[PDB]
Coordinates of C-alpha atoms and ligand atoms in Angstrom, one line a residue:
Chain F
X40 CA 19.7 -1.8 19.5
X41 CA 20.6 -1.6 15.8
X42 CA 21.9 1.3 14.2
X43 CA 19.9 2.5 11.2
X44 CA 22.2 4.4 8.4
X45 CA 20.3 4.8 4.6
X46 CA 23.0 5.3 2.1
X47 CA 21.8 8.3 -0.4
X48 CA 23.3 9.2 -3.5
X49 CA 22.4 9.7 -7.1
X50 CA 21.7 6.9 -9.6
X51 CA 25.4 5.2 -9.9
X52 CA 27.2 7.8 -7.1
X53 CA 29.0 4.2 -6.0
X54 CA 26.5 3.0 -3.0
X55 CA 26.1 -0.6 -3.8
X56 CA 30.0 -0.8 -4.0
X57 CA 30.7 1.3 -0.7
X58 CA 27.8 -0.4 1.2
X59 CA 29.6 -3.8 -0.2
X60 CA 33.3 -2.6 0.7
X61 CA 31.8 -1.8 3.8
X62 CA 30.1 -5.4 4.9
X63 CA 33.1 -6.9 4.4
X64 CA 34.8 -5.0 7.7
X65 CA 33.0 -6.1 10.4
X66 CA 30.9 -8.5 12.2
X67 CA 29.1 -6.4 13.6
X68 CA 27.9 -4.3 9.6
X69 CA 24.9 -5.6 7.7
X70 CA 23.6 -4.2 4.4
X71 CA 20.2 -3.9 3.5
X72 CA 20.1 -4.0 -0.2
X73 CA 17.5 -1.8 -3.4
X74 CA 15.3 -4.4 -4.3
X75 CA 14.2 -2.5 -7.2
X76 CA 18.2 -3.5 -8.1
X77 CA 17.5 -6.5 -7.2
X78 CA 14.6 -6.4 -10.0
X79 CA 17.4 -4.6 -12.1
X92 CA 10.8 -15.6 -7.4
X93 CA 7.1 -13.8 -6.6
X94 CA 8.6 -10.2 -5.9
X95 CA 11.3 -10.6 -8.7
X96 CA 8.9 -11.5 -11.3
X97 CA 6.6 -8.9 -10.9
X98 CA 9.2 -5.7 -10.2
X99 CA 11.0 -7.2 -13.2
X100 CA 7.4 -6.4 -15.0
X101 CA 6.7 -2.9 -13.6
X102 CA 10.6 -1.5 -13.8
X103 CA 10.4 -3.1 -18.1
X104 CA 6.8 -0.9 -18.0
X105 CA 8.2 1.7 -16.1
X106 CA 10.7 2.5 -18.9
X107 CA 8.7 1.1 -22.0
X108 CA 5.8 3.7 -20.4
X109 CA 6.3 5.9 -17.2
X110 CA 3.1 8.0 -16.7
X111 CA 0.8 4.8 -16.6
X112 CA 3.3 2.8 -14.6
X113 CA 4.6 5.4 -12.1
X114 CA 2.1 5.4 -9.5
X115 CA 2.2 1.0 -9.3
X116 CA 6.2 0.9 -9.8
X117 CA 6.6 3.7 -6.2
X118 CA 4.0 1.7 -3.7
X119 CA 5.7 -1.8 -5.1
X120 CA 9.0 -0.2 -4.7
X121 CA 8.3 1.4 -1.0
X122 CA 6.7 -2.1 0.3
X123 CA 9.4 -3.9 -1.1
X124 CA 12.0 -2.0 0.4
X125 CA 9.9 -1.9 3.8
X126 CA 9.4 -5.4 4.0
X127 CA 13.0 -6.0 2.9
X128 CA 14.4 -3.8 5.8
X129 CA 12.7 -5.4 8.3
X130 CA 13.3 -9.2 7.2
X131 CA 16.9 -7.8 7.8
X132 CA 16.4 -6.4 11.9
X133 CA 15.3 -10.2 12.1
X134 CA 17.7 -12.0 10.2
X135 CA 20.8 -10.3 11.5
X136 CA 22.7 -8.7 14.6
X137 CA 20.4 -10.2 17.6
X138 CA 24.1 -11.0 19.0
X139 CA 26.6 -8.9 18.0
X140 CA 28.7 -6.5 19.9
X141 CA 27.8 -3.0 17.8
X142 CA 25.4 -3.9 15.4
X143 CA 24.9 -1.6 12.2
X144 CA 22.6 -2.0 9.3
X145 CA 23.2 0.3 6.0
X146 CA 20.2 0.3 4.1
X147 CA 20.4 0.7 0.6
X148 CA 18.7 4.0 0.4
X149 CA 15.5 4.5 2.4
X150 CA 11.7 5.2 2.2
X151 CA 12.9 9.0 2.6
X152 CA 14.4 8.9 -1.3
X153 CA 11.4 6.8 -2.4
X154 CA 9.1 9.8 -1.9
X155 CA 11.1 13.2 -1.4
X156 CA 13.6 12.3 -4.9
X157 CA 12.2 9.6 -7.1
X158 CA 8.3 10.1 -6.8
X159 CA 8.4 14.0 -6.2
X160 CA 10.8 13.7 -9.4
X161 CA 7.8 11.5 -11.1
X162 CA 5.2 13.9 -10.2
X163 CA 7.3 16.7 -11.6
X164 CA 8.2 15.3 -15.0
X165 CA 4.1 15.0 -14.7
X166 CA 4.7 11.2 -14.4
X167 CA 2.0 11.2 -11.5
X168 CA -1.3 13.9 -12.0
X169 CA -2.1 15.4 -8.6
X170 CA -4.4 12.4 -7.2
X171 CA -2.0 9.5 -7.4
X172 CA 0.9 12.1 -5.8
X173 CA -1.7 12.3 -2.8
X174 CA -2.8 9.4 -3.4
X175 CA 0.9 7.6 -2.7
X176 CA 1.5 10.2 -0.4
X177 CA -1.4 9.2 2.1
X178 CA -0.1 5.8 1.4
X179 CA 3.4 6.4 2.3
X180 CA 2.5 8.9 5.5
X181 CA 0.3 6.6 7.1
X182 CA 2.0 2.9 6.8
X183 CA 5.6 4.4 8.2
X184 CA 3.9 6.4 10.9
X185 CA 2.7 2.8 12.3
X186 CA 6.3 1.8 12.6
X188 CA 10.5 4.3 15.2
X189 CA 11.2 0.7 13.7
X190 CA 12.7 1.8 10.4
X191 CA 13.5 5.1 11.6
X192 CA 17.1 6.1 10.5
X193 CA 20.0 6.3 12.7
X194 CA 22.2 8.4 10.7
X195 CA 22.7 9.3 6.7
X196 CA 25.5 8.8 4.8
X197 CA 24.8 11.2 1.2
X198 CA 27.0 10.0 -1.6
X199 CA 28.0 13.0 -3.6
X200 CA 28.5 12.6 -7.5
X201 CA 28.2 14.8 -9.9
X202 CA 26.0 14.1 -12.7
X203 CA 29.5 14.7 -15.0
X204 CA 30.9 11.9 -12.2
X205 CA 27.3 10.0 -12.7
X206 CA 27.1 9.6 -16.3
X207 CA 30.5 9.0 -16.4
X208 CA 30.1 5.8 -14.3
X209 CA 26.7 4.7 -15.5
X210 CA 28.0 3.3 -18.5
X211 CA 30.1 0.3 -17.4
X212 CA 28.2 -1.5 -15.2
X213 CA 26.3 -3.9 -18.1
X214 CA 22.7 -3.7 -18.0
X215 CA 20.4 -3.9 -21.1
X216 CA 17.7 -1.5 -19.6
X217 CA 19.1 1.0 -18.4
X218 CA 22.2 2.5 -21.4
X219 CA 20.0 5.3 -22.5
X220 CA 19.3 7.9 -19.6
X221 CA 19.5 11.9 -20.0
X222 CA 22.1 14.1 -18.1
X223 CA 19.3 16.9 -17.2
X224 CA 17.8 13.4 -15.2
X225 CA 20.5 13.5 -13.0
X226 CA 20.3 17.5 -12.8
X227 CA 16.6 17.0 -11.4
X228 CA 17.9 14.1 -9.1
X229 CA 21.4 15.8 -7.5
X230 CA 19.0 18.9 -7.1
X231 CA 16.5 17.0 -5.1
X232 CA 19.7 15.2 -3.4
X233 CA 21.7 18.4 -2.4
X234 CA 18.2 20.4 -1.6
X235 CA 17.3 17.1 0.9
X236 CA 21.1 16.2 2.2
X237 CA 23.3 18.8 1.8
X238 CA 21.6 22.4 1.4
X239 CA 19.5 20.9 3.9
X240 CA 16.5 22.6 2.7
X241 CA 13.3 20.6 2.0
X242 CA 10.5 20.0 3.6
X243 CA 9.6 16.5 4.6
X244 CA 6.6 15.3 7.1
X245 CA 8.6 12.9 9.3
X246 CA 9.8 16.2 11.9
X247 CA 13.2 14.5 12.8
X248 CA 14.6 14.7 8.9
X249 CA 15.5 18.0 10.2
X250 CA 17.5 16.9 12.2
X251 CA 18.7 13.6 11.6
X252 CA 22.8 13.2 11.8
X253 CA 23.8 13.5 8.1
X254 CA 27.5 12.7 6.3
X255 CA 28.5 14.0 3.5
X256 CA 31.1 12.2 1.4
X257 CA 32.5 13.1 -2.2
X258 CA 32.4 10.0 -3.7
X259 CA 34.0 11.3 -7.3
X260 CA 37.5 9.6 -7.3
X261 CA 37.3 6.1 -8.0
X262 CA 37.0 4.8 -4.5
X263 CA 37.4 0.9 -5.6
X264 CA 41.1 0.5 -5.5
X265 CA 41.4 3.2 -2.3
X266 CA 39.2 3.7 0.2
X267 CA 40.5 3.8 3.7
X268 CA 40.0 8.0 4.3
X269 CA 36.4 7.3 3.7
X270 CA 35.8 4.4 5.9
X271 CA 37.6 6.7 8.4
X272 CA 34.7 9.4 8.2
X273 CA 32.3 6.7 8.1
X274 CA 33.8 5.1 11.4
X275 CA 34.6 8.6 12.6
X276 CA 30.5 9.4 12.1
X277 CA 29.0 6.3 13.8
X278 CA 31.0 7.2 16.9
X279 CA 29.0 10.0 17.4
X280 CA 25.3 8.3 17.1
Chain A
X40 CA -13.0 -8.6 23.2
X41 CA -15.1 -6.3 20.8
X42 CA -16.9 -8.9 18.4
X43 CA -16.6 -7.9 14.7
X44 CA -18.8 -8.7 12.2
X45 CA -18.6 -7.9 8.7
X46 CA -22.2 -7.2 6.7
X47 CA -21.9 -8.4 2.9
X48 CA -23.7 -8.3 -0.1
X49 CA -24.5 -6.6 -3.6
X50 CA -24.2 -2.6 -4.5
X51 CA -28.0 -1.3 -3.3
X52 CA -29.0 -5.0 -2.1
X53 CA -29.6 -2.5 1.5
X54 CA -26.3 -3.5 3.7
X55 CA -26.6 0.6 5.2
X56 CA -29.9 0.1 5.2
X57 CA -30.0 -2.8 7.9
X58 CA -26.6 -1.5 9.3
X59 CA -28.4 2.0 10.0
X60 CA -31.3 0.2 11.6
X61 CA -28.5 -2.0 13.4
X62 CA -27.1 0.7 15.0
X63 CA -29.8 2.4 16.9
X64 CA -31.5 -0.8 18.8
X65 CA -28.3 -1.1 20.4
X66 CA -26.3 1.2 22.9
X67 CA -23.7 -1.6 22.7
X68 CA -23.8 -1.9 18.8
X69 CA -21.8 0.4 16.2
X70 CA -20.9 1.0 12.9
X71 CA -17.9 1.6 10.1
X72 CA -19.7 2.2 6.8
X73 CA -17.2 1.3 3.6
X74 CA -14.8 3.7 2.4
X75 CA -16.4 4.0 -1.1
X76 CA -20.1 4.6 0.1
X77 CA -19.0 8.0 1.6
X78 CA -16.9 8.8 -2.0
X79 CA -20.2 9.4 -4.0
X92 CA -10.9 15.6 3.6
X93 CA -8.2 14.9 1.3
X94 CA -9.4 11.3 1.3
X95 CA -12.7 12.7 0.4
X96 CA -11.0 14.8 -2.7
X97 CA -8.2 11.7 -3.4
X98 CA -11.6 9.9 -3.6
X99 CA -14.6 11.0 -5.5
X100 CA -11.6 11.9 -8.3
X101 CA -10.0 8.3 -8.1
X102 CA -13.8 6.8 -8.6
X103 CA -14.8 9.0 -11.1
X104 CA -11.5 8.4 -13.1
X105 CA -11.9 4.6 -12.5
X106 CA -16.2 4.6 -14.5
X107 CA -14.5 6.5 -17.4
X108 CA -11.3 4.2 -17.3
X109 CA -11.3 1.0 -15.8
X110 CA -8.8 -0.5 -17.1
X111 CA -6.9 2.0 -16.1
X112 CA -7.8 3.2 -12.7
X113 CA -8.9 -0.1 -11.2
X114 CA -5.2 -1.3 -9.3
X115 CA -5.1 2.4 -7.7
X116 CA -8.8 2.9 -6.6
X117 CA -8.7 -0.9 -5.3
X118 CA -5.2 0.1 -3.4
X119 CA -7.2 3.0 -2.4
X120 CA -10.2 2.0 -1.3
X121 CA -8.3 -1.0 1.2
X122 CA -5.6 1.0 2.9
X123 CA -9.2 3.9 3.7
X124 CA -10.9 0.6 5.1
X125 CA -8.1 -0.8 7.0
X126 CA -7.4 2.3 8.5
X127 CA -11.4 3.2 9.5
X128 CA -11.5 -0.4 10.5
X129 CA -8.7 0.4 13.1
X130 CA -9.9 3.7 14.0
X131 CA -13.1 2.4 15.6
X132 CA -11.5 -0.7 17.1
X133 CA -9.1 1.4 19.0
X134 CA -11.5 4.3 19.4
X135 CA -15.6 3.9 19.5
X136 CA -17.6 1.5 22.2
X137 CA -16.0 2.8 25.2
X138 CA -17.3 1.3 28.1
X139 CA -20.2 -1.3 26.3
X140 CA -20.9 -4.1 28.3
X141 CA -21.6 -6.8 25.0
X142 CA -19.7 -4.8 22.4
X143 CA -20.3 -5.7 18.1
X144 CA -18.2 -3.6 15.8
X145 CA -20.6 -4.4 12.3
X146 CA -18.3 -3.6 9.5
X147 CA -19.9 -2.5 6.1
X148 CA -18.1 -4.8 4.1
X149 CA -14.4 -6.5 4.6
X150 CA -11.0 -6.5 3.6
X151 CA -12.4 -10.0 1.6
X152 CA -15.0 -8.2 0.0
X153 CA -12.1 -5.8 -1.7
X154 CA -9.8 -8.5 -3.0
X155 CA -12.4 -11.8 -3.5
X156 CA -15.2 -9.8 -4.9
X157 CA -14.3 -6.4 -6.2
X158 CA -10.5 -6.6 -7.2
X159 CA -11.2 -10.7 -8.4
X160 CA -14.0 -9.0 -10.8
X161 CA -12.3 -6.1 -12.3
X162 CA -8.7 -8.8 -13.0
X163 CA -11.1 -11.5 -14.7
X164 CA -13.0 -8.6 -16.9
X165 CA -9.4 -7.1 -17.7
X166 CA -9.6 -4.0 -16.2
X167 CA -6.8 -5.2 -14.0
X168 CA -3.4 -7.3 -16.0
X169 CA -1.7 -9.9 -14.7
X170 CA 1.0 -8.2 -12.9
X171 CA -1.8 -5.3 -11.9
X172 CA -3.7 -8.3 -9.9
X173 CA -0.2 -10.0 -8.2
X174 CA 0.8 -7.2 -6.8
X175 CA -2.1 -6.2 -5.5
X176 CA -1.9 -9.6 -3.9
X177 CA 1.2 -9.2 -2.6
X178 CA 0.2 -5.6 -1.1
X179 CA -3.2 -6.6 0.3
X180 CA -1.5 -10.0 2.1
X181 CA 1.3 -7.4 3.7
X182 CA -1.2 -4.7 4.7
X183 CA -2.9 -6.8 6.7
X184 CA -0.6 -8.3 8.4
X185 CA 1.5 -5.8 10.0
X186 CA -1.1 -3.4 10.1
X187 CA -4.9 -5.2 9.8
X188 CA -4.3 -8.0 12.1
X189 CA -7.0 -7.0 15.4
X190 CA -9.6 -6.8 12.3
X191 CA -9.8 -10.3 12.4
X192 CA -13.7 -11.2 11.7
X193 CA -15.2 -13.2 14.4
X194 CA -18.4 -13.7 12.0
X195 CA -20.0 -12.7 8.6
X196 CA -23.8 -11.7 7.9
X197 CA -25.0 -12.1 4.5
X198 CA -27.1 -10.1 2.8
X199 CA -28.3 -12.8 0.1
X200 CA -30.6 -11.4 -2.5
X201 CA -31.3 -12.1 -6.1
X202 CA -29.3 -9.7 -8.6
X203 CA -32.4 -8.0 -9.9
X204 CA -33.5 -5.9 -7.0
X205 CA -30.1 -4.0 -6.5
X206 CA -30.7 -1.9 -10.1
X207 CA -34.5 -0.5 -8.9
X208 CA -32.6 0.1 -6.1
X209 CA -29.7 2.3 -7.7
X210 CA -32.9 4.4 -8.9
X211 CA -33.7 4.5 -5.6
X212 CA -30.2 5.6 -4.3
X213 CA -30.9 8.1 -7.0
X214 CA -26.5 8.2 -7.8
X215 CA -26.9 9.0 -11.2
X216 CA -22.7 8.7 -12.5
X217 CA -24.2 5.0 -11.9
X218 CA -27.5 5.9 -13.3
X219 CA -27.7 2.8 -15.8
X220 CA -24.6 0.8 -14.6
X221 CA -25.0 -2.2 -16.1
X222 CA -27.4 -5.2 -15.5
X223 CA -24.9 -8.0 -16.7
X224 CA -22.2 -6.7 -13.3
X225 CA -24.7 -6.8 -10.7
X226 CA -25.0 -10.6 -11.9
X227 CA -21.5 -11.0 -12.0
X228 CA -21.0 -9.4 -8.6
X229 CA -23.8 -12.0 -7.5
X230 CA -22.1 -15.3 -8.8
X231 CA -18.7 -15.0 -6.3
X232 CA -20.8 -14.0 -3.1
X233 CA -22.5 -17.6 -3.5
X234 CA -19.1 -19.4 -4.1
X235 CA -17.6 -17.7 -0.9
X236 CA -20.2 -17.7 1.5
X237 CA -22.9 -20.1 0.2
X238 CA -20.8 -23.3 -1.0
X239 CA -16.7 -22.5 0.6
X240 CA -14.9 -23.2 -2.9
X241 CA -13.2 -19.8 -2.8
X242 CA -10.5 -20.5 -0.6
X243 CA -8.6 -17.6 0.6
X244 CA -4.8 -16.4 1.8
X245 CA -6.2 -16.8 5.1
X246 CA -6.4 -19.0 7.6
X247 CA -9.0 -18.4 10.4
X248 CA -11.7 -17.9 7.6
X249 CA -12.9 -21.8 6.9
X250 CA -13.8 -22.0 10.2
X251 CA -15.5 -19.0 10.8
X252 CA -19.6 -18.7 11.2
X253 CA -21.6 -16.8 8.8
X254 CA -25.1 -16.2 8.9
X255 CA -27.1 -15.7 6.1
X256 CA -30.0 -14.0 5.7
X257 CA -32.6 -13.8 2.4
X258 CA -33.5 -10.5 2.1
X259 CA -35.6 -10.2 -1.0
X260 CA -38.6 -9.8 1.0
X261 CA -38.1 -5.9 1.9
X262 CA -38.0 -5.1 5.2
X263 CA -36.9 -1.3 6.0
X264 CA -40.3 -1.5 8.3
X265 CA -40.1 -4.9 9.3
X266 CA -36.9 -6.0 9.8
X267 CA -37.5 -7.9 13.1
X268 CA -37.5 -11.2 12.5
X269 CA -34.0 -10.3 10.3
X270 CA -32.7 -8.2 13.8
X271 CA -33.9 -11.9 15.5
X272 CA -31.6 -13.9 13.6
X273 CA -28.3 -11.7 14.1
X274 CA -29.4 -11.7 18.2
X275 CA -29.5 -16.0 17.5
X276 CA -26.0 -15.4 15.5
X277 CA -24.0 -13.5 18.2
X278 CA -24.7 -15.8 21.1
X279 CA -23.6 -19.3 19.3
X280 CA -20.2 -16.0 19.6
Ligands
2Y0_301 C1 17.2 3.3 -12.4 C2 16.2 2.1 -12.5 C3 14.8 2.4 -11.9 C4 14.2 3.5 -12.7 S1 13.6 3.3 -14.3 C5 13.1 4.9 -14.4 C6 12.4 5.6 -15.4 C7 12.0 4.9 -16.6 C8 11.3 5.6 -17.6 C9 11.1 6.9 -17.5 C10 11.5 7.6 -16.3 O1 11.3 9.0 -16.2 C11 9.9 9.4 -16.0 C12 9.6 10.6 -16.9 N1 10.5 11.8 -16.5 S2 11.3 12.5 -17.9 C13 12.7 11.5 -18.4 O2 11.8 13.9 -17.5 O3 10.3 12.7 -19.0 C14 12.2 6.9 -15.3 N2 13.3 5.6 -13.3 C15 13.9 4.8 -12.3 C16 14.3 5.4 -11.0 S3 12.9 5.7 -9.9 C17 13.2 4.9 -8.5 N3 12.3 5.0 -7.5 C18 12.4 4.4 -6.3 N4 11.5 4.5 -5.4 C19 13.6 3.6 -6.1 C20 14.5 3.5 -7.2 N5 15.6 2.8 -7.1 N6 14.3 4.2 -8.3
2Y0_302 C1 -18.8 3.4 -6.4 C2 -18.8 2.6 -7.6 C3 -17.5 1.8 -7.6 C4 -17.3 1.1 -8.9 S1 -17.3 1.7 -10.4 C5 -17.1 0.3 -11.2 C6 -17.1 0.1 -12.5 C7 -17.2 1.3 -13.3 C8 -17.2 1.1 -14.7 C9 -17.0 -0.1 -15.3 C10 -16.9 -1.2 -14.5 O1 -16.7 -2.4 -15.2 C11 -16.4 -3.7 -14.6 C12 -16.8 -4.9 -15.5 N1 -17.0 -6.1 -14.9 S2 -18.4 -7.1 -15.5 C13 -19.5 -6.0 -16.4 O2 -19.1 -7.6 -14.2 O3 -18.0 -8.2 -16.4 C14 -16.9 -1.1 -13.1 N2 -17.1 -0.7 -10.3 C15 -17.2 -0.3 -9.0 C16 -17.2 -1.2 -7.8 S3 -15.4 -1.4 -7.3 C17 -15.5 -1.4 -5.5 N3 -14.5 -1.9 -4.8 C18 -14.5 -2.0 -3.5 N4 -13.4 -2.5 -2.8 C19 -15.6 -1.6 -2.8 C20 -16.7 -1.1 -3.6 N5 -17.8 -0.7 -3.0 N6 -16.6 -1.0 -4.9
UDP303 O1 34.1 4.0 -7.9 C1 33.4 3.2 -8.7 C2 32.1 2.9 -8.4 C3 31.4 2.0 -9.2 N1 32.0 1.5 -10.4 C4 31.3 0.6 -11.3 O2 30.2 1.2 -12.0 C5 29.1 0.3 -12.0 C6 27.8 0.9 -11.3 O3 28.2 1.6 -10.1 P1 27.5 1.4 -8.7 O4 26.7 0.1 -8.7 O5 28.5 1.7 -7.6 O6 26.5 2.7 -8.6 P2 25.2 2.7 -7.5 O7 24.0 2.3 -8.4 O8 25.6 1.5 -6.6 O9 25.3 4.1 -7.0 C7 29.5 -1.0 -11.4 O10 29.7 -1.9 -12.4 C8 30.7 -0.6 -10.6 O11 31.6 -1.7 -10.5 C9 33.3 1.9 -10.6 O12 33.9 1.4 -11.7 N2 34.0 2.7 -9.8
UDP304 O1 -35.1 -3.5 2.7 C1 -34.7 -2.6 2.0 C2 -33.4 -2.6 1.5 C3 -33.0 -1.6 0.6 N1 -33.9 -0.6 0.2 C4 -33.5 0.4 -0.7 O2 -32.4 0.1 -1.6 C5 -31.5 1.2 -1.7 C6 -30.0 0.8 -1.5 O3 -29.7 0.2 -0.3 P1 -28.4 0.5 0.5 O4 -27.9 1.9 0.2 O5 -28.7 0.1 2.0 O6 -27.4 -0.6 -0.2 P2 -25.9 -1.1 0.1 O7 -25.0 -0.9 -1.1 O8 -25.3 -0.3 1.3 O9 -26.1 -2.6 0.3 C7 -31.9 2.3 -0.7 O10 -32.4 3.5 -1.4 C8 -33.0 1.6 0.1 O11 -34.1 2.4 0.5 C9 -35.2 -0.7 0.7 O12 -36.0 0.2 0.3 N2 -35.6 -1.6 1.5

């Protein structure tokens, strides 16, 4: 009786700071935060190993850094439908992004940049179509897509204050907003879950500074759950 | 209400062998041959690559072809659970190995021989606690069978099996292979991260002798086994 939203958006588009703005106005709103940003304790030690290996060597890490990632974010999701909102009038959960950007941008994108050979793509991909086809649990509600351009993107990934991650390309991002506006907003690619076709999706330029104004969005995002 | 039993022992120490004679005295008796037996569908592609990658490699390719070869035998495991032995009257689901034999034998192995690094061997700890448990519990053993042979007759036997990408595989890891079979299921020091297992009946059987055509009093010790079930 929870309503399931994932927050997409490119690498720092804003999420963790509108899904954060946006627990703070209701009773009723839960967040679901990235645990690997939470890496960014048993799980902490070891995604805090994969993410340094991850970086310090991507195409032997790639494969073990996605399943970790995906469980993690699985078994985070549903600690939260537990957890939270067995009273509450209107109950809604935003999920830091979902199991849907785990495979279909980051992965993909992995796979692509030849990060993952053919076998440990279906390999992870067999993994990832069986385990969530158990579950309607997780299923998502409704999307919220975070638009930033990678100009916008860079331009905000410096301040945050984060040894590891300072040095990332622009052409990253490029590959990233593709696979995001291809997925969310050109509404193109192809995905084996059927209802990602047709799953109510919200698209919201997230390119002014949205921290000391944000009302008009919280409108649209108010204005969108009413429809559900 | 379908009894499961999980058949254990050492690569060629004959656990299809007795499983395939298993299977045909019974009506009310079936069987769910391990994942990697069949490697030597996509899965099929996924794995004869993923174990062909892992002898060249193993330190390497041993976290994904163990992650690979659990979430095949979980899933086959489930399959015949929900599916197979219809309408049997005293039903047995014999499992070629378990979801034990992956992680306390095979992935235990390949971490203490460094094929497998720390962080390689805690999260597939983490994974293998969590796939079972949303997804594995109704494969809950009701009893093990043991296969308990010395470590020299499983590499005649590999000459036997004739699989020659394992043609000479070594001596020295059918004996290491032997050592934590005899810890777990001979003695009880290898404690688990589960439950139900201490108290759980295992029968062992010594199966040096051979027996392909006289496996009779062996089939009389498993009919002895299932009713103390
Ligand atoms: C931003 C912190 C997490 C990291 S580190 C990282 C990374 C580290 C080293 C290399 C790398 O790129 C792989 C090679 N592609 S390349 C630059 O065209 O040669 C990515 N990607 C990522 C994003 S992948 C990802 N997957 C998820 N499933 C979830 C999530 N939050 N992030
Ligand atoms: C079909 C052959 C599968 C292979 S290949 C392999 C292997 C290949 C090359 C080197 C290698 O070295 C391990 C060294 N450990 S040692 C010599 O005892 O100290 C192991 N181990 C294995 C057994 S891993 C395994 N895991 C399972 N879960 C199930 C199963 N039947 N087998
Ligand atoms: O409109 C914004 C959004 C974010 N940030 C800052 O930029 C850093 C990273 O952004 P954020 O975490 O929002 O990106 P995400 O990864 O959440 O998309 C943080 O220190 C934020 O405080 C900002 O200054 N203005
Ligand atoms: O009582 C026996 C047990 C085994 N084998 C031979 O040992 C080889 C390997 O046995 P199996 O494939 O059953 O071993 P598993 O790995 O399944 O234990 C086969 O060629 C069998 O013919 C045999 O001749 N008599």
């Amino acid at each position: 009786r929870i309503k399931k939203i994932s927050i997409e958006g490119n690498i720092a588009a804003g999420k963790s700071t509108f899904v954060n703005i946006l627990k703070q106005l209701s009773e009723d709103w839960e967040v679901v935060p990235e645990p690997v940003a939470r890496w960014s304790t048993m799980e902490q030690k070891n995604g805090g190993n994969v993410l340094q290996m991850m970086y310090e060597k991507p195409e032997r890490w790639s494969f073990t850094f996605q399943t970790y990632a995906c469980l993690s974010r699985i078994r985070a999701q549903l600690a939260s439908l537990n957890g939270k909102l067995k009273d509450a009038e209107k109950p809604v959960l935003f999920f830091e992004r979902s199991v849907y950007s785990d495979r279909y941008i980051f992965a993909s994108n992995l796979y692509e940049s030849e990060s993952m050979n053919e076998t440990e793509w279906t390999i992870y991909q067999d993994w990832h179509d069986w385990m969530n086809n158990q579950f309607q649990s997780l299923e998502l509600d409704g999307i919220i897509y975070l638009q930033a351009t990678p100009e916008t993107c860079l331009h905000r990934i410096y301040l945050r204050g984060r040894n590891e991650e300072q040095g990332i390309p622009l052409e990253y991002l490029e590959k990233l907003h593709y696979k995001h506006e291809s997925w969310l907003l050109h509404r193109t690619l192809k995905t084996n879950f059927d209802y990602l076709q047709e799953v109510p999706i919200l698209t919201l330029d997230v390119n002014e500074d949205f921290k000391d104004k944000y009302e008009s969005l919280v409108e649209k995002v108010k204005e969108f759950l009413s429809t559900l």
